[model samples]
Target: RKPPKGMFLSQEDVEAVSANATAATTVLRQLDMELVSVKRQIQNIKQTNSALKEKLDGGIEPYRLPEVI
Candidate 1:
């Protein structure tokens, strides 16, 4: 009752592969969403850096910047 035993091995294998392909589609959808989110974050940082560089191009940078250590 647990599985089809030896008589249906080929059928089981086909079902297994098809199930995996379905699951992979769901998993890959999440991966694509995360990729879009990461790309948006990177683009936001790039824009911020570009704006900061433009400001620094006008004159000397401000000193009061905090250091990590």
Candidate 2:
């Protein structure tokens, strides 16, 4: 029996659709990993900058004038 115009598909068609879905999922997974790596690098840079600023501020000393003889 002929299936409806576009309402039904064969086994091969279903397999093709499944394969494409798997491929798309794999691409997204790779992109997610890359995103996580980039975010970690950004966080490390920010932390390093903060530590440098703290050291600079904490090391400031008051100036003293020497007495003339």
Candidate 3:
């Protein structure tokens, strides 16, 4: 209804970019969070890798602790 207040942009153009701004920002934030999820997935594998291998193999050989002496 009112004239676009910001410098040279038209009202429709401003609305289009303005509407998309919040969605774009949310996508950027999710991109950051997606890394955290992927990071967890990596850590989960490393922490559980031995058990996972045993589970799949059904009989992984037991490892012995090296002599401390």
Candidate 4:
């Protein structure tokens, strides 16, 4: 059977396109790892922030009125 015209890629064209897809896939994989690491760092920072806030809240004294009034 005759194949349709302009419906198939040359071997070299297919390889070139496949190489580009592999490169993009590798970059996306690396980005996903970095994103996970960044999320972990953000969680640690939030925990530290909460600890500091609690520590600060523990040091305050109540207001006082004058004894001569």
- TM-score: which candidate is best? 4
For model 2, residues 1-69, the per-residue Cα lDDT tens digits are: 878888887887566557864865776788899999999999999999999998788463565567798
Every model's TM-score = 0.52, 0.51, 0.42, 0.54
Tell me the whole-model lDDT of each prediction, alpha carbons only.
0.77, 0.80, 0.74, 0.78
Judged by whole-model lDDT over C-alpha atoms, candidate 4 comes out at: 0.78
Q: What is the Å distance of residue 51 in model 1 from its true position?
A: 0.7
Could you tell me which residue pairs clash in candidate 3? none
Sorted on lDDT, best first, the list reads 2, 4, 1, 3
Candidate 1 deviant stretches above 4 angstroms: 1-21, 58-69
Error of 2 at 69 (Å): 24
Q: Which regions of candidate 3 deviate over 4 angstroms? A: 1-19, 50-69
Q: Stretches of candidate 4 above 4 Å error?
A: 1-21, 58-69
TM-score of 3: 0.42
- Candidate 2 TM-score over all chains jointly: 0.51
Model 4 TM-score relative to the real fold = 0.54
Tell me the tens digit of each residue's lDDT in model 3 across 5-40: 774756665665568648657656788999999999
Error of 2 at 36 (Å): 0.7
- Which scores higher on lDDT, 2 or 4? 2
